[PDB]
Design a protein around this nucleic acid. Structure first.
Ligand SMILES: Nc1nc2c(ncn2[C@H]2C[C@H](O)[C@@H](COP(=O)(O)OP(=O)(O)OP(=O)(O)O)O2)c(=O)[nH]1
Ligand SMILES: [Ca+2]
Ligand SMILES: [Ca+2]
Length: 341
DNA sequence: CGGAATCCTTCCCCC
DNA sequence: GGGGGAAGGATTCC
């Protein structure tokens, strides 16, 4: 069992560089402008020249401009990066039929039925980086190990423009060595629950009654962690498919006025519908981010698919429900369609 | 900002 | 008691 994970590098900013090489060498910040005030928004990603000063995905655009007033600030163009990504996925399909496209910039490849050992996995590594570099001008990091989790961990160590193998004898040392927060699927909230249990390394999950662990972090995440620490995790590479599609926009002002919120909501539906392209949902959820940034949703499943006119009027009922059931002003409003026929 | 998956918890109907 | 859903939220990741 040999897994090869590819993670493109600083992907949105790099696509922006490829499309305008005069940017190379500069710090580049791809931005999501919310539109409220000048430079309201967040940073979607930054290249390494900007990242080394603390500019990174998550921080407000206004914060990045204090740090790096003279960086280049580009608005996010998802559709472009999506096409460039689709193209790259096609290159990887030629190295395995068993391919799992995990996100816009990450894929796993099952190269058992191609390569015989780590030495050859590695070479396939350079072949692939070099192909993508030649054909699309994009640098990627490659991680290789015996399962998907360690393949990813590998790339994270090796990025950017890296390649790295984590072999069976190293898996074993990491299970002891590796900080459990650095395991994929463990965010701040789970890492904290684990400290309180005394777990700071994968291996520690063996010192705990399964039922205490299960009760603290859920059964699913408990099994996941235990199987990992037992050198036994072994999920297969599977083609996955969109289960939902939606759009949330930010309003100019916060509001509780139905007539004020409706147009943003309609525009969210319009765009969601465009994005569905020949796919029909039986579920609709209306999603609202309140002023103190909590997220309240209200949904409805139909026994048939949902036409646009239906989605329009049903979404208004769901928005009225939210307003009736939650006292705060609304900041961001949108829709999500799911359960495709 | 934004997009999305997966999971957990509660509730519900009902054999 | 437990199968079988749906709803709404928690949490995660890019
Ligand atoms: N709008 C938005 N987009 C994000 C965010 N995080 C990641 N992305 C998008 C843009 C990124 O270029 C792309 C890839 O995610 P990554 O976590 O792998 O970041 P990055 O491209 O910098 O990877 P890298 O560290 O260079 O290997 O997905 C985010 O918080 N907001
Ligand atoms: Ca990336
Ligand atoms: Ca981490």
């Amino acid at each position: 069992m040999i897994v090869l994970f590819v993670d493109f590098d600083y992907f949105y900013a790099q696509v922006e560089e490829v499309l305008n090489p005069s940017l190379k060498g500069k710090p580049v910040v791809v931005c999501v402008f919310s539109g409220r005030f000048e430079d309201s928004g967040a940073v979607a990603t930054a290249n390494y020249e900007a990242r080394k000063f603390g500019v990174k995905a998550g921080i407000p655009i206004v914060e990045a401009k204090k740090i790096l007033p003279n960086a280049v600030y580009l608005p996010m163009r998802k559709e472009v990066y999506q096409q460039v990504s689709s193209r790259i996925m096609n290159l990887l399909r030629e190295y395995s039929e068993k391919i799992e496209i995990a996100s816009i910039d990450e894929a796993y490849l099952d190269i058992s039925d191609k390569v015989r050992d780590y030495r050859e996995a590695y070479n396939l590594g350079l072949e692939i980086k070099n192909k993508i570099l030649e054909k699309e001008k994009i640098t990627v990091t490659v991680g290789i190990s015996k399962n998907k989790v360690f393949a990813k961990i590998a790339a994270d160590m090796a990025k950017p423009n890296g390649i790295k193998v984590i072999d069976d004898e190293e898996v074993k040392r990491l299970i002891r060595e590796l900080d459990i927060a650095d395991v994929p699927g463990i965010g701040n909230i789970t890492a904290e629950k684990l400290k309180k249990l005394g777990i700071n390394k994968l291996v520690d999950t063996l010192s705990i009654e399964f039922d205490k662990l299960k009760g603290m972090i859920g059964e699913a995440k408990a099994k996941y962690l235990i199987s990992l620490a037992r050198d036994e995790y072994n999920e297969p590479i599977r083609t996955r498919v969109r289960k939902s599609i939606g759009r949330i926009v930010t309003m100019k002002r916060n509001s509780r006025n139905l007539e004020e919120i409706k147009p943003y909501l309609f525009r969210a539906i319009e765009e969601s519908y465009y994005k569905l392209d020949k796919r029909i949902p039986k579920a609709i959820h209306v999603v609202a981010v309140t002023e103190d940034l909590d997220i309240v949703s209200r949904g409805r499943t139909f026994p048939h698919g949902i036409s646009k006119e239906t989605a329009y009027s049903e979404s208004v009922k769901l928005l009225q429900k939210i307003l009736e059931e939650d006292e705060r002003k609304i900041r961001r409003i949108g829709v999500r369609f799911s359960k495709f026929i």
